[PDB]
Each structure stands twice: as C-alpha cells, then as structure tokens.
Design an enzyme around this catalytic site. Structure first.
Site: not given
Ligand SMILES: O=S(=O)(c1cccc2cnccc12)N1CCCNCC1
Lengths: 353, 18
Positions: A54, A56, A124-125, A169, A171, A174, A187, A204
């Site tokens: 979570t 901005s 995808e997770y 972006d 780093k 990310n 991202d 950044t």
């Molecule tokens: O880990 S996240 O919440 C996330 C984003 C997109 C897809 C994702 C898939 N699986 C887990 C976390 C994920 N995330 C938010 C911004 C910060 N940088 C890393 C990506």
C-alpha cells in the site's frame, strides 16, 4: 583475437538470433498495443484475502478467484485519487503496457476491469516478495547469485528497449522473486515509449542517472546506469551512492567517482565502471555494440543467456513457500475497505482502461 | 566503514520515488 573461429561464429549466430526474436516480439507487442484488452473479469469473481502493499501508488491485495481457487495480486486504484494526484496518463499507460508485453520476467496481467470507483489490475501472484527484503536479510548476494538476477534484468531491458520502452523504476524494492527463484518486474508507472529522448524527472535518488539529475534530455541509457546501481547494491549490500539527504547523493552520482568493496572481483568492478559511466559516449549499453557490450563482458562469461531465458538454470535461492496463498514474504498492513460508490466517478478520464 | 556509513545515512529501508 579473443575468440577463435568456432566461438566467434557461435556468438555471431546467437546475436543474430536475438535480433530475429526481438523483431517478432515487437510485431506481437504492437498488435496488442494498438488493440488493448479490457474488462476481462469483475470484482465479485474474487475473494479479498490480504493487503500485500500500500502506498501513494494505491493498494495491491492478495485475492482468490472463487471458481479456480487461484490466487492473484490485485492492484486497486481509486479513480478520484488518481485524478487528484495527476496520474491519469501514468495509470492508463501502465495497464496498456502490461497487457501488451510478454516476457518471462515481466508480470502477467491476467485480468483487468473497473467499476464506479476503482480500477483493478489482476496480476499473477508472485509469492517470494521483494528482492529488497531478501537482500537486506542476507546482507549481500554472492557474485554468482547477483549475476543470476542481473542476467534476467539485462534480458528484460533488451526486450523492453527493443519495444522503445524505457523502464526508469529499477531498484530491489521493485523486483519480486517467484516460486522458482526467478525475477518478476511488476511496476510500469514510470515506463514510457521513447524512441529518442525524454525529459521527466522521475525515479529514486540512489538509482538516478546523472543526466536525469542534471535536467538533460535522456534516453534508454538511464536503464543501463540503473542496472549498474542494482548490480552494485546486490553484490555489496548497499548502493554505490548514498548519503543522509538526496542532494548529497546527487553530488556523488554526478562526480564520476565510485568506490568498491574489496571483495568485488576485478571483472565486476570493470563492468560497473562501464555501466556507472557518467560520460554517455562511453556508457555500456549506449555504444555502437548496444547490449552486446554488456552481455559479452567477462563478468557474464559463465552466463548461458538462452538457458536463463528458458528458465532452465537452477536458481540460487528459492523463497519459502507454504501454499498457493502464502503471504509470509510480504509485510503486514492495516486492512482498509474496498468501497464501490453507487455513482460512476471519472468515467470519461478512464474510458480506455 | 562504508557499511557503517550506509547505516548512518538513514536510507537502509525502502526508498520512495522522488
Ligand atoms: O509487491 S507488490 O505489492 C505487487 C505488485 C504487482 C504484482 C504483484 C504480484 N505478486 C505480489 C506482489 C505484487 N508491489 C507494489 C509496488 C512496490 N514494488 C513491488 C510491487
């Protein structure tokens, strides 16, 4: 010379095959770029499980598809908040990129949709969490371990740049680690189609190329600079340029001076001096031989680029995984409601989503 | 040491965009 006949022929053939792959990949990207997919699911198809991130940037939640039981990461943007923060174009462009690209280290957008209040990207997770966490925990990655990740970034930027996409972006925060230990890039809010130059100050502090700091028009070489920062930080445990305040970081970045830990190999230092090159006429990735100056560098001599792409290399590290919905590699956040208003908000602005 | 300098910077946590 450095290569005998067989090695030179093999390298040449490999490099020509990359060109052939990229030309096809560009054809496929442009078809989806010109005709984006929309509205491929809806909110009540998913159970909300937990907030994975979570800020901005919005929220990302772990969700479970009710019928398949498959888990996904759902990015939720509040349309009114996007408008207020002047992020309409970035938000539309991020989704348009994600639905058009296809590469094994770029996160897959499985579904997207909107409702009266919010925009939703169902990706995808990626259960292993951010590289950042693992890096700070372990301290630093050995060179082979850093190299395994770096190679994936090299290939991903080779792909993105062939599509004229600058990333901007990069780093550890990310980069996510998947169940097989490979990288996922997620991202795309700062990414832009740029065949030539662009001018926006974004990024950044630790990862900003000097030409961005110096308010120049700049090109895809900023991503190669950032790769140098990333490789440095992976291998040292800290980035090459840091200080209490961003302005002091920027002074160090533009200085043309970088120092290395005594445990860095000479090959690594040579690569990093050529990536962290303030002089654009000398920076690897920005020369006549393009990405090949990086891919053919001694530090990558053991890298089988095709095997990395095919995901056939054993990863140095597999994150802990207890099941399809395990969130142990992500932080805990206060859980907020997903409010959906009875009235459509900002409809015109988000027609394309 | 450089590591100690990194700790002293206060920028060991997640870094936001500018
Ligand atoms: O880990 S996240 O919440 C996330 C984003 C997109 C897809 C994702 C898939 N699986 C887990 C976390 C994920 N995330 C938010 C911004 C910060 N940088 C890393 C990506």
């Amino acid at each position: 010379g450095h290569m005998g006949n067989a090695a030179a022929a093999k390298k040449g053939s490999e490099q020509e095959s990359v060109k052939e792959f990229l030309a096809k990949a560009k054809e496929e990207f442009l078809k989806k770029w010109e005709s984006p997919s929309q509205n491929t699911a809806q909110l009540d198809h998913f159970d909300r499980i937990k907030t994975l991130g979570t800020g901005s940037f919005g929220r990302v939640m772990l969700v479970k598809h009710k019928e398949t039981g498959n888990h996904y990461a759902m990015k939720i943007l509040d349309k009114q908040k996007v408008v207020k923060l002047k992020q309409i174009e970035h938000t539309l462009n991020e989704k348009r990129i994600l639905q058009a690209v296809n590469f094994p280290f770029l996160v897959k957008l499985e579904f997207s949709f909107k409702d009266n209040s919010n925009l939703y990207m169902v990706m995808e997770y990626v259960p292993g969490g951010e590289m950042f966490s693992h890096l700070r925990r372990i301290g630093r990655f050995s060179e082979p371990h850093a190299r395994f990740y770096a190679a994936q970034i090299v290939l991903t930027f080779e792909y993105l740049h062939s599509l004229d996409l600058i990333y901007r972006d990069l780093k550890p925060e990310n980069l996510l680690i998947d169940q097989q230990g490979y990288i996922q890039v997620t991202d795309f809010g700062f990414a832009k189609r740029v065949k030539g130059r662009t001018w926006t100050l974004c990024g950044t502090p630790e990862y900003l190329a000097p030409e961005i700091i110096l308010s120049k028009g700049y090109n895809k070489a900023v991503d190669w600079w950032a790769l140098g920062v990333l490789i440095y930080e992976m291998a040292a445990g800290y980035p090459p340029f840091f200080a209490d305040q961003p302005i002091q970081i920027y002074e160090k970045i533009v200085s043309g001076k970088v120092r290395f830990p005594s445990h860095f190999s000479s090959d690594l230092k040579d690569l990093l001096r050529n990536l962290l090159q303030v002089d654009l006429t000398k920076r690897f990735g920005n020369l006549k031989n393009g990405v090949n100056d990086i891919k053919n560098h001694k530090w990558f001599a053991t890298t089988d680029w095709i095997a990395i792409y095919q995901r056939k290399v054993e990863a140095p590290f597999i994150p802990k995984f207890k099941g399809p919905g395990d969130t142990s590699n992500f932080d805990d956040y206060e859980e907020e409601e997903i409010r959906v208003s009875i009235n459509e908000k900002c409809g015109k602005e988000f027609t394309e989503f | 040491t450089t590591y100690a300098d990194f700790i002293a910077s206060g920028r060991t946590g997640r870094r936001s965009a500018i």
